[PDB]
């Protein structure tokens with residue numbers, strides 16, 4: 487029912503995808519590491535969760551970068567799309583969560599209806615390509631600075647998405 491497509495450099499978004507899966511049900515969510523994925527794998531789901539950390543100051547994580555150049559080959563109309571990222575707001579206050587911002591911008595143009603928007607309250611940052619009229623395009627996690635907050639963030643966003651998705 488939901489395909490969660492994640493990239494990871496140092497394992498944190500992956501560890502977070504697993505918590506997400508387990509919050510919905512591991513029956514409801516299928517995980518796909520986008521290092522092993524085909525862009526046409528995204529066609530298999532009408533409900534997508536897109537996980538990407540921002541790397542090297544504002545860049546997509548390297549596996550998502552590879553897939554990004556082909557998002558063009560896919561039709562996202564009729565799909566509902568949620569985004570999550572891991573990032574470091576203290577180290578990169580100017581580019582916090584840019585990657586999910588970049589991914590959503592593209593997937594949105596190609597058809598996908600974004601669900602899963604999230605309050606910027608309680609984050610300390612200057613700018614982000616994830617910002618959308620005062621909210622983040624999706625769940626912003628910081629395992630570097632706010633890891634005590636992650637569990638309850640995920641529980642709360644997942645409950646939100648169960649509603650947005652119709653589950």
Ligand SMILES: Cc1cc2nc3c(=O)[nH]c(=O)nc-3n(C[C@H](O)[C@H](O)[C@H](O)COP(=O)(O)O)c2cc1C
Pocket residue numbers: 493494495496497498499500539540541542543544545547572573574575578581582583584629630
């Ligand atoms: C050199 C480098 C550059 C980074 N740049 C950003 C950034 O621009 N924006 C951001 O939010 N986080 C940035 N981060 C933090 C990572 O996104 C964060 O550590 C994330 O949890 C990594 O996810 P991963 O473990 O799944 O690869 C950067 C981290 C490193 C080491």
